[model samples]
Target: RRFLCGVVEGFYGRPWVMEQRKELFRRLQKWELNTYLYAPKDDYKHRMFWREMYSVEEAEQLMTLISAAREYEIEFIYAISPGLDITFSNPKEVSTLKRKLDQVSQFGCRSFALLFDDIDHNMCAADKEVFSSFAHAQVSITNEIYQYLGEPETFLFCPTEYCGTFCYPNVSQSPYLRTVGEKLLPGIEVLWTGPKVVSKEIPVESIEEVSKIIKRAPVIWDNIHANDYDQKRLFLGPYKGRSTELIPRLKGVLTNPNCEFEANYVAIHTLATWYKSNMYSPQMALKLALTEWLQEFGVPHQYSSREQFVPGPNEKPLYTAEPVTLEDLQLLADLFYLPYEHGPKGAQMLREFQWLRANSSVVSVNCKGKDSEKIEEWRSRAAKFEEMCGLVMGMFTRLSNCANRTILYDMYSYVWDIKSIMSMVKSFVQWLGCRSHSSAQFLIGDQEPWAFRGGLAGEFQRLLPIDG
Candidate 1:
């Protein structure tokens, strides 16, 4: 079977609009992604009231979604979270579970998931009387569901102890994992979240160990790009750390990214690129994916340096020079947008900003001669700032959709900062030209030129009204 690479609409906030899901289907088709799981945590029928049936109107809507997925050749897996309050020993509850999935099956959803994550682990009194353990109860229900669906082409399960960090004692020693490995049906796939819920890296050894415990190659419910835990930050950086060597060792990888649907371009795009590459360097894959992404916005330029010649065998080159281009600027912008402190990309962007700040000092006006050279230097710097501002604004405009545009605006606080800086730079340029031979005293009544700051400072101050 092909690796299951796709999105999972499994978030805690407001569920995506119908239009967004349809759009996502089209994108997944274009990107060669195969699976999309529907598990919106806040959806009333999906979680809050798991046993409740969808109304006729709701059922039709889901049917339309299923048809859309079929057209795109994507597997639309309908997931349920009965673990919230299910009584495993009760026949009525088990039948209710079967009935819910049966309704979805009639709508043409062939794949299904039983999500037992994020719920209390304690078993009900009835369950405790009949089942050996929590794992046994879950396994029994899942096995029954798998049989009820006639052994679906795809069946997934998400355990309460979803990751190593949450596994009692540890992964290998956990009795829950041991029971799940031994008791679960072989055809069913289990979902794992690596070392932690939002792991920075999924080591090969970790997967191998978990595979032994689960008795199946686990499908990763990768949350590397998730932002629900920290709404203030968005992970626009490319997917990294997982090696291609692990691909054949696992069932698949599915990302549950930012709750904002439009904020997932980098996350999903890079995963597709990573899946196809043979070279398997995350950095190189990101560069390729980013190039395609930028082209989608009409910015397709790329920049790289060629090796310079050495004068002699013994004499080393004094310094290396790299030409600045739109690609360099775009890369820096991407780094600044994501802002991971440990990576080389983030460090390089910080260096670029430091360089700009150190060199952006205002030169003193002689008021006696033509400092044309100094004025020209300031113009060049201002022009660069203006270019950056224009690029960001262009991106903002190209987003078109309200959800996507707002997501971009929120993720990039630097856009606002850049605009603010550009305003000041423009004013400084005007001041430089005006001071050709004019006295500083006449312009500002003995005030220093360096003291003359412009832009929307006063406007912002007036609106704020309170001091920190």
Candidate 2:
């Protein structure tokens, strides 16, 4: 089964640096994962500045990246999105598209993708006049480019309706998909983002249904680990949801994982696990990923500003840092787990906190000098909640002290936010359990700037009296 089990650096935020990608190639080789699709949404030349050629320095970096992928035996698929404003009917525009890809091909890229996703469906005046529909225009240009590229072994086309949700009136009936299915070259593979843009579960039924319309077993551009749409979320969970049976049904699956380069350890490892075998266990994958990730956390931090100012011998040289334990990494994963579900410990902690908040009235009722068996139960649960909070804080402490400052720096802000939010929640819970007569509470409504969750968005949401 020559399935594409790989990573896709197709996020929107800042792309991973060169050193990061080279290291990734090493991991991909070691893990036996095989494809790397380069389609960072904000890469100017990949999208908005589609016509411009890469600068000399930029081209060299890309060449290095491609060579690194070659060393790992991974397919380095260079994807270019020109649908933003391309006059699909214009020869010059198509020529520029071909020219850009030709330059990439010279960089030793054997696989290429033409992306028409996330763009307006309506074609420009010239394209509209020349072609009957937007899909036809896209297919013509794509086929032309496909032939232009000497018909690369792996050619991908991402339609405007890349996901089932985006398919107007649905995938089977969408004129766009129908045209692409009937008109596009049979060899040219179509890229689909499962059932939704970021699906919880990619069902076999959904895959089978879409295949007939696309007339191809789509190369799934899995977005299960993608967190670009949310500012606060990061997925460090193992790959789950999609059944092993769907493996043979799909052409391949390339996970568009988190924006944080280092945070995708579990996402990539677990996917590779599932892709390789039918006997897939998410928990086992997670444990393996964490153990390996813990090693990364143990490596000493590289040179920083501290290296510039070498202290005298009297300062006892540099302090020896502690290594991160499996327990610590496990806690880290649980906190920022999957989108559809949390990790085991994560769910327990969340539900426990929810119960405490929901039963908060027990403490309030006791404010009027009331007492009952319910009071004792509430106290016990509150004590356990506080303990859970303390453990999270402890995990953060150990993680902060871990040897690798690079990974720490990447995750610092997100973990800090969680720690701070939990601190507030713990304080609130403790206050409820402690109060004998203090009716004055600040937790009910929005607090000051320092206590609130966000800035403008938080304010606007709080402003709306639509809690119901």
Candidate 3:
């Protein structure tokens, strides 16, 4: 299926993938990913620049990797982008970009892309003639290089207008796509990142519309759980799990993930299971279940369930209630520091934790709306709890992070010290006990805490705050 999956290559803006490329690649293969997008600017700027191609030594290394990928039957798609240093408007900048593409083509890369999506669209709005002339200049440069490389048909073009979001701001559709398509040789591939490239569910119908408009198979460049640009846990939604809902026009699928390259495992597993079965497989179904459970528990988790370390349906273990507690929060802090040898499993775990923290407030807020009466009742009982005041403050503190707080003063909220953060979490959970009337029944069943022995119904009962 000409599958494309990649991470934005650059410095460790959020310290995720570049440091863990091997693990990321392993997970990509397991998920049936066959294409890798190469962008030197993001991942290799300090190391090298693609504008003039690879140095002799660099070219050798890249070729070796390409050979290795060929052995495994993986296609390497080189995406030459300037990222922030897009000097496309300047003649010198155009020359540098062209050189890099030419050098990389010699390495035997069969697929290619020129990504201009990251550049601000408004930079060109003042003068359409100036912008179009600049764009055409870059295209002419690209055309010259493509001919030199034997006009490889496999190419990807990301215009400034194709950027993900509801508003295009200064990017107009009027002549951008049509002009670029007409000027460029025909039969080249085009890409569009699904709306809200990060963690929102993209409608399948949207994909169908895009495919029809483009008149070519549309590739969904998914940016889900990619942590570099978006360091915090900001968005979480049921990733439609690579629905076959658009199979008719779905040329292929690509998942661009956040940093913590290891986290790609969960996404890889989810996508792989979906692609293989033409529907959600048992593993995928279980993952969805676990994801919801973690969300309910207020712990953002990446994996839904486990087969080996986790117990089967009949076995009961300790720590059943998914209630957030002081201890659980503390342990979570410690958990963040647990080191592991590189691999897909580690990546999956990291992604799970990232997801848990990102959606903590959203999930809690949503739950409060549905069960406010019970929450207030629990709040009254919680008033007598030992840490009632502390817990209340802790909840407020955590919630404040999500509110529209000023960026400078609230920067610390975006980055937590895993150690101290857990204590606050524990306090929040203790408060939940005093006010919630639902008994921990729903909490235990809904949130899949660490598996424990026997039933948690009675123990949760004992833990509840009751009227004296």
- What are the RMSD figures for all models against the true structure? 12.0, 4.6, 14.9
Question: 313-349, model 3: which lDDT tens digit per residue?
Answer: 8878634322344433222222332112222332443
Order of all candidates by TM-score, from best down to worst? 2, 1, 3
What is the total number of backbone clashes in candidate 3?
32
- The models' CA-based lDDT, in order, is 0.73, 0.82, 0.50
| lDDT digits (tens) for residues 299-323 of candidate 1 | 2222333565546868875443222
Number of backbone collisions per candidate, in order? 0, 0, 32
Task: State the displacement of the C-alpha of residue 451, model 2, in Å, after optimal TM-score superposition.
Answer: 3.9
Q: Which parts of model 1 have CA positions greater than 4 angstroms off?
A: 298-468
CA lDDT for candidate 2 = 0.82
Candidate 3 lDDT score at position 262: 31
Q: Per-candidate TM vs. native?
A: 0.72, 0.90, 0.57
- The C-alpha stretches of model 2 lying farther than 4 A from their native spots are 299-323, 361-372, 437-450, 463-468
Residue pairs in candidate 2 whose N, alpha carbon or C atoms collide under 3 angstroms: none
Q: Which model is ahead, 1 or 2, in terms of lDDT?
A: 2
lDDT of 2 by residue, 1-468 (tens): 466768888888888899989988998888888889998888988888989999999989989888878878999888888888888766898788878888888888899988888888666676677899888888888898888778777888888998888888987888988988999998888888877888888768888888989888988888888888985798888898889888778788888878888878778888888877852788898888877777776554445663267888687676555556778778878888888878788789889888888888877654455576778887898899898889888777777775667787876888998887778778788667766666666454455334457777777767787644
Best by lDDT: 2
